[PDB]
Amino acid sequence: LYVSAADICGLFTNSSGTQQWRGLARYFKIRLRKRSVKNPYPISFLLSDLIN
C-alpha cells in the first residue's frame, strides 16, 4: 500500500527576517478489504518469462 504526502504550511520568518519553510506530519487511516479479482497471468505468461 503506497502512501505519499507533502504538507508545506507557510513561511516561518526569523528574528532577522530570514524566511524558511515549515511542514507538519499527516495522518492516514486507510480502510482495506479483500477484493476478488481475476488472475491476469496464467502459466502461459509464467513459462514465457523463463524463456525470457
**CA pair distance 27, 8, nearest whole angstrom:** 15
Please say which residue, 30 or 37, places its beta carbon nearer to a second copy: 37
Taking CB under 8 A as the rule, does residue 30 contact a second copy? no
Taking CB under 8 A as the rule, does residue 2 contact a second copy? no
- The string of DSSP letters for 1-52 reads -------EEEEEE-SSS-EEEEE-------------------HHHHHHHHH-
Taking CB under 8 A as the rule, does residue 47 contact a second copy? yes
Taking CB under 8 A as the rule, does residue 23 contact a second copy? no
Contacts to a second copy by CB under 8 A: 39-52
